[PDB]
Amino acid sequence: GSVFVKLLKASGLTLKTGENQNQLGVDQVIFQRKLFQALRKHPAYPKVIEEFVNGLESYTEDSESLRNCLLSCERFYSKSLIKLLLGIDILQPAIIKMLFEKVPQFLFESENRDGINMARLIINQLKWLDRIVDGKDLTAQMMQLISVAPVNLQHDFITSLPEILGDSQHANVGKELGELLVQNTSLTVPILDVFSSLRLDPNFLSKIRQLVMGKLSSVRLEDFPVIVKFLLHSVTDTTSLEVIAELRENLNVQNSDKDCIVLVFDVIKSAIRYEKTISEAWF
Amino acid sequence: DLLKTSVVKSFKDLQLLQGSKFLQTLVPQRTCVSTMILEVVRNSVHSWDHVTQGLIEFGFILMDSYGPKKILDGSKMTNQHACKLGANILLETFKIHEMIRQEILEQVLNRVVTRTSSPINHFLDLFSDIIMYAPLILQNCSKVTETFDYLTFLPLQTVQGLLKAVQPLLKISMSMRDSLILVLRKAMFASQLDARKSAVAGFLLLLKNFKVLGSLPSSQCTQSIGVTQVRVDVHSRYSAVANETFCLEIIDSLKRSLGQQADIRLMLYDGFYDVLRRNSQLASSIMQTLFSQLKQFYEPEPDLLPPLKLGACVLTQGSQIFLQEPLDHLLSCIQHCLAWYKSRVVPEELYSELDDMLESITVRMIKSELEDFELDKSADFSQNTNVGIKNNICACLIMGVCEVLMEYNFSISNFSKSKFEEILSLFTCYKKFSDILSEKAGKKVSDSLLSLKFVSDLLTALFRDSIQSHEESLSVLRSSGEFMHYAVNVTLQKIQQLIRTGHVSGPDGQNPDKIFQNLCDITRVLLWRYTSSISLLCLEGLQKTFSVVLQFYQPKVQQFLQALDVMGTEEEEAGVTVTQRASFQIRQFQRSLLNLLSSEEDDFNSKEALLL
Structure with a gap:
């Protein structure tokens, strides 16, 4: 029983x-108070955060032991051990670093x-973390992961960006994804998907x-139908007459x-049919 | 114009016949334009292209002109009859001619998304009927899937109708389910309030029935654990986890709107309950989210007089003051969820604390008076000032919170003479601020936070009689007499708000069966107390109820007049008519009027005789 093993079973979580x-x-939250309390009360607090992460990483070196930590626990369901730990703030930034460390090994697998990838x-x-402690870094990792990711996987990774990244970092993404779009015409579909759901400058759009x-x-x-849809739904305020032209x-x-x-005109017909902002701007 | 007008005068006439026996003796029943046109639809199967062109047009014409108007913003029979006929034509013509099916559907939907000022509710019916006929035909329709895209600009009311009617299609197409989930998901990130308010409604309706709706996995559901390609195959350890971890994702996603506008928060406090009562493994995550929400507004320090932080529920931006969070609805939700948690869920330290908070909140709310709120003579509640409007909201949260703890402490103990005085004291505080607001003029109607279920139970416990020697604690409420017609006035408000809209405020607010059940319990309680001021209020509620059950629950009129009676076994169902039941109820009211008139009392009550 290492620092990682023993302190987990002390906080209520027994590894299987x-x-x-x-x-x-105990309750998934009550375990979260306990594991924080354990780490603050330990004789060396500053260094133990590294000690706990290390045990986590080495226990994780088993492919099957890993997929257990990524999946739901057991008591009426709670979330995964890793998500639970991701919650704890002092523990979050160091663990996020780890997750991306182990990702490359499974990237091309x-x-x-x-059927679990x-x-x-x-x-x-x-996905949907309560708060991101180190935000600027989570984005950079994600972006550098999206850059090298397989073209099958990287389409689902861009689409998740809004869910993964907090509200604060939507700006960084814009300048990033934008540059990705000039280097890839193959990323057009997923990029436009994200660009709709983020916070952006009118000038940038x-x-x-x-x-x-x-x-x-x-x-x-x-x-074409999926791309034209982004163009006509960005017309809500009045850029409308300009965009359409x-x-x-x-x-x-x-x-x-x-x-x-046929399918392009189904998007363009329903466009002017439902929204007057369009039909009048085309007229 | 000729056809349209002939339809109306055809209904007006057959209405006049039922108007008098005098006409029924002289005039043999007449065939009406209604059943004629519905025959033209039936005779159209023979390949009349020229006739159906005008039929659909006439169909919508009737629905457009004679459809509901004044119902949304504040001889309606011949309107209803025209509109019913209008929807029948279109529905009936749809079941017959295949190639105009998509044509009709394009036109029905088009009114649904595009109108937005005028009530679309009657078209959503047609739409819901069109699908209920043959869903396999519409399963793939892109016109139904496109709608999800404008589902963000649609008013919250239309979104609901759209989602309800569209569920029969969500039980077939996975793609439509995923295509819905994707659309709802990016709405969570939309700027416009009404888009996020819709997204919450979709995800709250999703979680409601997963066990039913999501039994077959979707592409979003399977993917939560990381499986893209799984189809037709279930090995349950990863199927049951794919389901649970996906739901959790939805709950984590809903949670962050709890930091958003007050309107959405409230919409969430109402949903979280119905989700707890159906999907029961979400209990601890729901309880969690609520307990994390309450912990923001709760002052832990014992003997800190305002147990809840009220000034925190008000946000100030640029000389405009909005209420954010309904701390009183936060309580109500916790109050009902905790109740389900304790009553049900026994096949641990979480729901244990929430209970302790509520009592701490009870005790400190009771003994804190007006200096801790900083109100009355000090703060004057003037609505033209920033100072006044922020105060008004406090007076309101204080009243709602008092209503909840009052409703909560009743459920804690029925038998403790001690806690009834807390219920009274919680009322005394509530009426302290209810007095303060009306004396100040002001601009209290539907405000009541009491669930209908409680109002029924409360009333039944106040008028019950049959009080056993251990139950004497009730006399704490019974002998008040202001809390006596506060209790009654709430029921009277809810029954009255039941006519205005079709809903009620609290949990099981809109549930045609659950509402109907309480109406029964509330009516048979009011009916006894009237036949035992209150009596007048009992009559007023008694009357409002009857007229509701008739114009809403009409098909249930039988079972309703049964609920007021006693039992009656089996062979009697064959022996008891609605005319049997009705007369027997009439004989009792016509009796008490007779006795009202026959008595020599100097003043005979005009209000009683009128509504009697």
């Missing part, structure tokens, strides 16, 4: 081997017998609409034939 689930003796389950822990409509030639025909010139001067022109 195999594919069973780690067992929580396929899904196993169970370790790479996606690790990041899933960051306008810079997006341009870079999207100019490279619109190298977009797949499947993504630009959208028109790019549709004008620049199975496959049918389903494209």
